[PDB]
Design an enzyme around this catalytic site. Structure first.
Site, PDB file in Angstrom:
ATOM      1  N   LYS A  49      39.440  52.984  46.324  1.00 19.22           N
ATOM      2  CA  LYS A  49      39.997  53.668  47.495  1.00 19.22           C
ATOM      3  C   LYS A  49      39.156  54.850  47.945  1.00 19.22           C
ATOM      4  O   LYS A  49      38.850  55.003  49.126  1.00 19.22           O
ATOM      5  CB  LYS A  49      41.430  54.152  47.209  1.00 19.22           C
TER       6      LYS A  49
ATOM      7  N   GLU B 289      34.657  55.915  36.627  1.00 19.43           N
ATOM      8  CA  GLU B 289      34.616  54.610  35.960  1.00 19.43           C
ATOM      9  C   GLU B 289      33.990  53.512  36.812  1.00 19.43           C
ATOM     10  O   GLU B 289      33.057  52.828  36.384  1.00 19.43           O
ATOM     11  CB  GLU B 289      36.031  54.160  35.579  1.00 19.43           C
TER      12      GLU B 289
ATOM     13  N   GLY C  76      47.193  53.155  45.912  1.00 21.91           N
ATOM     14  CA  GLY C  76      46.470  52.246  45.027  1.00 21.91           C
ATOM     15  C   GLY C  76      47.330  51.229  44.296  1.00 21.91           C
ATOM     16  O   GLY C  76      47.007  50.043  44.275  1.00 21.91           O
ATOM     17  N   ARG C  77      48.454  51.681  43.742  1.00 24.87           N
ATOM     18  CA  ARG C  77      49.385  50.809  43.019  1.00 24.87           C
ATOM     19  C   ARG C  77      50.253  49.962  43.955  1.00 24.87           C
ATOM     20  O   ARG C  77      51.176  49.269  43.518  1.00 24.87           O
ATOM     21  CB  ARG C  77      50.252  51.638  42.062  1.00 24.87           C
TER      22      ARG C  77
ATOM     23  N   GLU D 267      53.558  55.345  37.156  1.00 26.22           N
ATOM     24  CA  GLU D 267      52.728  56.262  37.936  1.00 26.22           C
ATOM     25  C   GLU D 267      53.472  56.764  39.178  1.00 26.22           C
ATOM     26  O   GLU D 267      53.227  57.874  39.648  1.00 26.22           O
ATOM     27  CB  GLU D 267      51.371  55.652  38.297  1.00 26.22           C
TER      28      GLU D 267
ATOM     29  N   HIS E 128      59.071  36.514  18.889  1.00 22.47           N
ATOM     30  CA  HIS E 128      58.483  36.534  17.551  1.00 22.47           C
ATOM     31  C   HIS E 128      57.619  37.776  17.369  1.00 22.47           C
ATOM     32  O   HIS E 128      56.770  37.834  16.471  1.00 22.47           O
ATOM     33  CB  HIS E 128      57.608  35.291  17.352  1.00 22.47           C
TER      34      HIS E 128
ATOM     35  N   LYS F 294      40.965  64.507  34.163  1.00 27.27           N
ATOM     36  CA  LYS F 294      39.695  64.310  34.871  1.00 27.27           C
ATOM     37  C   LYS F 294      38.831  65.571  34.857  1.00 27.27           C
ATOM     38  O   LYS F 294      37.626  65.491  34.609  1.00 27.27           O
ATOM     39  CB  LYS F 294      39.928  63.877  36.323  1.00 27.27           C
TER      40      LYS F 294
HETATM   41  O1  LIG Z   1      48.047  54.737  43.006  1.00 30.59           O
HETATM   42  C1  LIG Z   1      47.188  54.380  42.195  1.00 30.59           C
HETATM   43  C2  LIG Z   1      46.624  55.364  41.198  1.00 30.59           C
HETATM   44  O2  LIG Z   1      46.371  56.594  41.839  1.00 30.59           O
HETATM   45  C3  LIG Z   1      45.342  54.926  40.456  1.00 30.59           C
HETATM   46  O3  LIG Z   1      45.585  53.730  39.691  1.00 30.59           O
HETATM   47  C4  LIG Z   1      44.096  54.660  41.315  1.00 30.59           C
HETATM   48  O4  LIG Z   1      44.203  53.372  41.906  1.00 30.59           O
HETATM   49  C5  LIG Z   1      42.830  54.722  40.439  1.00 30.59           C
HETATM   50  O5  LIG Z   1      42.577  56.076  40.118  1.00 30.59           O
HETATM   51  C6  LIG Z   1      41.592  54.168  41.103  1.00 30.59           C
HETATM   52  O6  LIG Z   1      41.329  54.879  42.298  1.00 30.59           O
HETATM   53  P1  LIG Z   1      40.244  54.268  43.310  1.00 30.59           P
HETATM   54  O7  LIG Z   1      40.922  53.018  43.823  1.00 30.59           O
HETATM   55  O8  LIG Z   1      40.072  55.404  44.288  1.00 30.59           O
HETATM   56  O9  LIG Z   1      39.025  54.007  42.469  1.00 30.59           O
HETATM   57  O1  LIG Z   2      56.892  38.445  10.194  1.00 31.41           O
HETATM   58  C1  LIG Z   2      56.631  37.789  11.206  1.00 31.41           C
HETATM   59  C2  LIG Z   2      57.741  37.300  12.105  1.00 31.41           C
HETATM   60  O2  LIG Z   2      58.799  36.797  11.320  1.00 31.41           O
HETATM   61  C3  LIG Z   2      57.354  36.227  13.147  1.00 31.41           C
HETATM   62  O3  LIG Z   2      56.353  36.736  14.048  1.00 31.41           O
HETATM   63  C4  LIG Z   2      56.827  34.889  12.606  1.00 31.41           C
HETATM   64  O4  LIG Z   2      55.462  35.038  12.242  1.00 31.41           O
HETATM   65  C5  LIG Z   2      56.957  33.798  13.688  1.00 31.41           C
HETATM   66  O5  LIG Z   2      58.322  33.451  13.808  1.00 31.41           O
HETATM   67  C6  LIG Z   2      56.186  32.534  13.385  1.00 31.41           C
HETATM   68  O6  LIG Z   2      56.629  31.986  12.157  1.00 31.41           O
HETATM   69  P1  LIG Z   2      55.747  30.817  11.498  1.00 31.41           P
HETATM   70  O7  LIG Z   2      54.480  31.534  11.092  1.00 31.41           O
HETATM   71  O8  LIG Z   2      56.654  30.346  10.389  1.00 31.41           O
HETATM   72  O9  LIG Z   2      55.557  29.803  12.592  1.00 31.41           O
END
Ligand SMILES: O=C[C@H](O)[C@@H](O)[C@H](O)[C@H](O)COP(=O)(O)O
Ligand SMILES: O=C[C@H](O)[C@@H](O)[C@H](O)[C@H](O)COP(=O)(O)O
Lengths: 564, 564
Positions: free
Chosen positions: B217, B223, B283-284, B369, B400, B529
């Site tokens: 924008k 960045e 932006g958002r 935001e 899970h 910033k």
């Molecule tokens: O409303 C949106 C926020 O203000 C923010 O997510 C913004 O979009 C970023 O800072 C990037 O800004 P630019 O688009 O100006 O790079």
């Molecule tokens: O501690 C881990 C949870 O209990 C859960 O994330 C589990 O890993 C899934 O339900 C898959 O289970 P299986 O690995 O038996 O498919």
């Protein structure tokens, strides 16, 4: 329900912590830095990882509402609740998972010292090492191109099929350790039962050169079995369309990571291709076991051993280091201070490393599924808040996403900032620009910008308009006093990742032990599974239901009217 | 700081809602279903999307602690705070973004009716439509292969370079609408300043066939400019290594989406290749503007128009539908009820559609935001809680992962379950298995499983052990009464996605207006910033600092000692 738990709230140390909160809770974090010039050093610990590159895990917990009196009282709480003895019980194989009467031995999976750990009078180490050797042999065959598909092609695509604990670890670790990976092997992850997940993966692979890994502890999870059956149907459908004989194809393209030997045989996978793990390995603590096969295929045996060693170094640190210099204990206590006294129900995981972009989702399962409990081991209702809501995204993307709320919102949100001194990808001045944000954000959260500072900044830039100054004044004010922990490593190597995950596993252990809950079970997922099984035969075109509440009835009826 | 705001807490409707909370807050959700047999229908609204496929957006807000008295009181709050008049002010171009004295016209970007909307006395519609036509022409050249790279190759890779509002929308929408995309065009997203992000993308593309889109924008975000400069250096480095003349290469490989015409010219991008948007586009709230170019390149002009039309249908519904049948207003009020009266500071976005896996991250920016503010438009400190913490993952992976905490934790977490009746990928019985979980989870959260029900289930399965029943009893108990909103659509088409996002944009508008805050500014990102800019020249090997607090000093000093 049952009677209320009094064991924690009746502790002399808990009563003292409540008293200390009333006394020092309103004191800003900056005040502690102003009264103690050596706070940064006194409220930080550096743990060496024992590697030749001199890597370490440095925890700075100084940006907190904690003075010496509070730090001492938190440590006394740990002594009163018997954390030292509980840790020894976990490490030695005692059945601490009381609701399931089972040991909790994920530390055995990475026990490089090979110190005997007993379950039912038998040392588990030879069995742990046998599977690690089986993983080494198989992963080497896949990586070198020795393992062939049905038509004779070397493996180019590795598809892991699993959900939760059989998915998040493999995803997080392969993403985190991508610079240490073999680039000619494409990793794919099918987890969701939504047909889209397997469909999109099938569009991205060359099934003749694909190895499917069915990861599941029980080998009965509906999502995983449904996806595995569709992956099998896809292999057979391809061969049939090309006119190729399908006999013996499943054995070359499918392997299993499970505890259930019987269910693996029923699917059609060879017993030689089953990688065993045990009941004392919790799913959300399984990336170190057979479940870690896709990680080993991607990064190699030597790098997987480094991952295990990093965890082992932190396991030894946690079990042996003095309370005041113990990283996972301190991290856990800072958390208890914010959750139970400040009433902070959320915790942000903010890793400043793009490779760690799937770390917040991993820690969501680790923390929330472990500590999101409301009953103690004894079966009494908790009288305190337990596990917080974990959220976060990789920095700096978070800064332009939700940091607005962390800085100027109505919620107190403890944050964990994780970063590396050295990048694996050195592109121009990217890393210093990146790290300038890492240090600045925690500083910003702590110091803020007072009404007087905003007035000085505007009047120094040349603004003579008292109206514009007074109008923009409150909107530009940062109250500060927002806490954060800074976790700094030299570089994100496999050993460093192992260290970070083990630290969080142990933080979760301490918090669960303080609250008196069972951090190792998951009874909360049962109701949703039972009610889904009851709704499944009701999802047919034109079918009408009346046995549920009016909302669920209306939703199922609408679905049935328009599904087809 | 400033004086406390009394305008909201002094409302007769607010006082009544506090009274109604004290009276009916402890009544379980199931009680409302037991006393009203038509609750499912009375507490739900279906909004037609106006398309030939008869698609709709159905909101079921019945699984809540809301009776007729509370619903009426919430609607009276909306009338007292002047929501109807505020919405008209937003839609007509009034400068509602008071801290920046600017209009808020994202609704103009998708105004398909071409109803004149004025800014500075000039209709903005011809300008909006001019950019949409420019986007159509360019996107068609890229898609058909007419647009060539420097060496004469057709475009195969499209790399968007932007962060926050210039990233999350393009990511979420291209992922959400993948079945409607042109598969031979690979979409890549560079956002993080971490060198890893651009590095990994450079490893995945054929730079000769790559179009780089610099989205920003302001066109000054550190960045984005750092990443854009590295992308430019990469193009020139490739051509130089191959001995190819670089003159005129940047104009064929780089385009810009911005409001800043001057900064785009300084980079070296042709004015013919700049896609304009305006200051009244937050932006958002920018995915509907020029920022949506990568979405249009992926899905095509006709599908992008469908995305805009879905938003337009909901904009018209929001501005014209009666209060009791207004979807975004009801969603916002249910949210205010939970945040300000129940004290629920978190909100889960749980989309049961794998393509919507990046929707929670998008809604994090949109909600957090916008509404993570602690001062009103008048500059007074808020006397109520504002924006909640948004989190979530695509279903069923969440089940899970962290549902254990939603079902059995110590926190009340309002959840939004989003699903589609028809899948775009029809693989066996995957969709019915998937949707059985969708309906079951909301039912489970609402009804729970009482101590008596657990005893009946165990004794019916044949358990004669009173010890095992009493021991497992509290661990298997689900208190229920956990709220949820169910959002059901016929299918996730571009029109359906547009409808969903506009609904959330309007929910955020209402909540912000009720609290009296400016949902359209972002002053909270400024401190981080400024402090990063101050730390950047201090990040040099061996340099030591002493001007910050001891933690920040210690961290910067350690970084400088080991960076090189
Ligand atoms: O409303 C949106 C926020 O203000 C923010 O997510 C913004 O979009 C970023 O800072 C990037 O800004 P630019 O688009 O100006 O790079
Ligand atoms: O501690 C881990 C949870 O209990 C859960 O994330 C589990 O890993 C899934 O339900 C898959 O289970 P299986 O690995 O038996 O498919």
């Amino acid at each position: 329900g049952a009677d209320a738990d009094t064991t924690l709230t009746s502790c002399a140390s808990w009563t003292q912590l409540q008293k200390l909160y009333e006394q020092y809770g309103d004191e800003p974090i900056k005040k502690h830095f102003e009264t103690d010039s050596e706070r940064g050093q006194r409220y930080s610990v550096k743990v060496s990882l024992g590697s030749k590159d001199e890597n370490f895990l440095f925890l700075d917990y100084s940006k907190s509402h904690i003075n010496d009196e509070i730090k001492c009282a938190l440590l006394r709480l740990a002594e009163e609740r018997g954390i030292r003895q509980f840790v020894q019980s976990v490490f030695r194989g005692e059945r601490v998972n009381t609701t399931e009467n089972r040991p909790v031995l994920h530390i055995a999976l990475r026990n490089r010292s090979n110190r005997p750990i007993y379950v039912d009078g038998k040392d588990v180490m030879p069995a742990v090492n046998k599977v690690l050797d089986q993983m080494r042999s198989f992963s080497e065959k896949v990586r070198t191109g020795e393992w062939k598909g049905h038509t004779g092609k070397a493996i180019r695509h590795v598809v892991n099929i699993g959900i939760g604990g059989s998915d998040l670890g493999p995803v997080m670790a392969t993403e985190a350790l991508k610079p240490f990976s073999q680039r000619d092997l494409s990793l794919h992850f099918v987890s969701n039962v939504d047909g889209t997940h397997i469909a999109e993966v099938l569009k991205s692979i060359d099934i003749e050169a694909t190895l499917f890994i069915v990861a599941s502890k029980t080998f009965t999870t509906q999502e995983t079995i449904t996806n595995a059956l569709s992956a099998r149907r896809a292999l057979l459908d391809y061969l049939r369309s090309r006119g190729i004989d399908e006999k013996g194809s499943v054995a070359k393209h499918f392997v299993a990571l499970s505890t259930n030997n019987q269910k693996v045989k029923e699917f059609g996978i060879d017993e030689e291709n089953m990688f065993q793990f045990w009941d004392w390995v919790g799913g959300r603590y399984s990336m170190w076991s057979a479940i870690g096969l896709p990680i080993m295929i991607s990064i190699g045996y030597e790098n997987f051993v480094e991952l295990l060693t990093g965890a082992h170094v932190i396991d030894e640190h946690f079990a042996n280091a003095p309370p005041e210099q113990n990283v996972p204990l301190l991290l856990a206590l800072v958390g208890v201070w914010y959750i139970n006294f400040f009433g902070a129900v959320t915790h942000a995981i903010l890793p400043y490393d793009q490779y760690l972009w799937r770390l917040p989702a991993y820690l969501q399962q680790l923390d929330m599924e472990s500590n999101g409990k409301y009953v103690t081991r004894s079966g009494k209702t908790v009288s305190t808040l337990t596990g917080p809501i974990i959220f976060g995204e990789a920095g700096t993307n978070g800064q332009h996403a939700f940091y607005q709320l962390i800085h100027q919102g109505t919620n107190l949100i403890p944050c964990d900032f994780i970063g590396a001194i050295q990048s694996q990808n050195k592109i121009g001045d990217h890393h210093k620009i990146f790290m300038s944000n890492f240090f600045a954000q925690t500083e910003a959260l702590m110091i803020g910008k007072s009404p007087s500072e905003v007035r000085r900044e505007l009047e120094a830039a040349g603004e003579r308009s008292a109206e514009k100054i007074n109008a923009l004044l409150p909107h530009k004010t940062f109250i500060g006093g927002r806490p954060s922990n800074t976790l700094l490593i030299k570089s994100l190597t496999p050993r460093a990742l192992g260290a970070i995950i083990a630290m969080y596993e142990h933080k979760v252990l301490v918090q669960g032990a303080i609250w008196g809950i069972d951090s190792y079970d998951q009874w909360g997922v049962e109701l949703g599974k039972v009610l889904a099984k009851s709704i499944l035969p009701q999802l047919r075109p034109g079918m009408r239901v009346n046995n549920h509440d009016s909302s669920t009835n209306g939703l199922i009826n609408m679905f049935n009217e328009l599904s087809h």
